[PDB]
Design a protein around this ligand. Sequence first.
Ligand code: RET
Ligand code: OLA
Ligand code: CL
Ligand code: CL
Length: 264
Amino acid sequence: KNIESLFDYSAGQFEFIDHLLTMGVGVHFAALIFFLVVSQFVAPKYRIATALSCIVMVSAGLILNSQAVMWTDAYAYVDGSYQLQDLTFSNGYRYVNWMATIPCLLLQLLIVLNLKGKELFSTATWLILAAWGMIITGYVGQLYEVDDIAQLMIWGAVSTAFFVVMNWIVGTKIFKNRATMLGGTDSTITKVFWLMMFAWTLYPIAYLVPAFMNNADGVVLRQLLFTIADISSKVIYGLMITYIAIQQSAAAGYVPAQQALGRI
Ligand SMILES: *C/C=C(C)/C=C/C=C(C)/C=C/C1=C(C)CCCC1(C)C
Ligand SMILES: CCCCCCCC/C=C\CCCCCCCC(=O)O
Ligand SMILES: [Cl-]
Ligand SMILES: [Cl-]
């Protein structure tokens, strides 16, 4: 049901995708260790924001690892090209994983925005409902990326509606609570918003690849887009969230944070 199943791959195409996914694994687990060791310099009220990055690193790292092994399982070098064998490859499992990772990305944002209690619970709930609506309708959509392009587009339109509404909630909370933020992170959080708009928008572009480049090179392009998007939306994003957590910790008087920033 996925366009990946339609083609044979050159050694070059096959190895590049393998390397992309493998590099993706290494980057996420490398970052995991960074987030782990810096977590001790985060004040208690923000420390969960950094823990969520650890959770995202392993979750994303495991899905990339799984995709890579699925890739090598599904294809074998036969008569001059990599051809589909008995096992299958699908991006569908990425969509399932987003059900967990996207709420984590959103939650760590709300935390450094200094949301608390009732407003935190209600905002998170609406955000998670919006994200799940987006992910589920998108998941259904890509089931048709070979059989019914028109259906892919319509489900994608519905998914985009959830996407836009989700982004509106995010933008609204960011620009409203920007003023509450310490240590100059009121400026930093603005760049985080634009990072999200950029990085998250790569995913619907990848989703549409079967519509504008239905060939083996389009398969490579999609994996390339996912890699750029994953690293940007999880790793670079996580680094900015953690930086914001540490800076606000130090400004709030948390001594290990102040000491940490003093060494650099
Ligand atoms: C770490 C993974 C992240 C942040 C994934 C985000 C995914 C999206 C923003 C996907 C959105 C989609 C649309 C807006 C339309 C097509 C269907 C989706 C699910 C690919
Ligand atoms: C934050 C951005 C992270 C970027 C991660 C991607 C790094 C490697 C990117 C690809 C370089 C281009 C490789 C050339 C493709 C060769 C085509 C092919 O053989 O299939
Ligand atoms: Cl605290
Ligand atoms: Cl993920």
